[PDB]
């Protein structure tokens, strides 16, 4: 069983200091959207991503052969953010094993329409993406104090001679290691990752 957090630990367990990292090509389910994480659009995006991921994972127990299939632990939710939470633009993502092809995604959408017909998966796409050279740091605590982590990552970029590429093309990137519906803001852990060049 593939566990990305265990097998590729540097990508999912930074410390509370900035570090340089090269993030290689990975396979993702992605949904583009806009607005507040409490809004319809984000809630449906996250629901769709997990619906597809679990349809693929649980196929081990069914009658369809997926070529190259391996069981896997569904990885943490991640998000790219850019542009007052209603004005946020984002891409919600879940990493997938390499065996997940466009045809596997199309199959999973059909299975989910039968078995989970209230879930709209029409916006889920499969994207392979090499994030590339980044700086990352573990943010511990409320999102309202993330400016301390970003500032400290910005200072690291200066000391290292790295340029900040953060914008609408190489984007601000969060990996959610805690569930906000299930823990206190002060105990949240979130990876913040910024593209550099």
TrEMBL record:
Stored Pfam families: GyrI-like (PF06445)
Domain GyrI-like small molecule binding: 21-196
Xref: SUPFAM superfamilies: Probable bacterial effector-binding domain
InterPro entries assigned: GyrI-like, GyrI-like_CCH_Lin2189-like, Reg_factor_effector_dom_sf
Highest taxon, organism lineage: Bacteria
This protein's name: Lin2189 protein
């Amino acid at each position: 069983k593939i566990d990305f957090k265990k097998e590729e630990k540097k990508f999912y367990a930074p410390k509370r200091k900035p570090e340089r990292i090269f993030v290689p090509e990975m396979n993702f389910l992605m949904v583009d959207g806009k607005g507040d994480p409490d809004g319809e659009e984000y809630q449906k995006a996250v629901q769709s991503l997990y619906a597809i991921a679990y349809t693929i994972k649980m196929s081990k127990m069914g009658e369809t052969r997926l070529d190259g299939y391996s069981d896997f632990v569904v990885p943490p939710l991640e998000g790219f953010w850019w542009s007052d939470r209603d004005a946020w633009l984002w891409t919600s993502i879940l990493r997938q094993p390499d065996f997940v092809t466009e045809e596997v995604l199309e199959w999973a959408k059909e299975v989910a329409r039968k078995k989970k017909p209230d879930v709209d998966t029409s916006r889920v796409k499969l994207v392979r993406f090499e994030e590339g050279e980044c700086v990352q740091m573990m943010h511990v605590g409320p999102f309202s104090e993330a400016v301390h982590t970003v500032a400290e990552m910005h200072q690291f970029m200066e000391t290292e001679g790295l340029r900040n590429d953060t914008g609408a093309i190489r984007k601000h990137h969060l990996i959610y290691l805690s569930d906000p519906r299930k823990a206190n803001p002060e105990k949240m852990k979130t990876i913040l990752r910024l593209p550099v060049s």
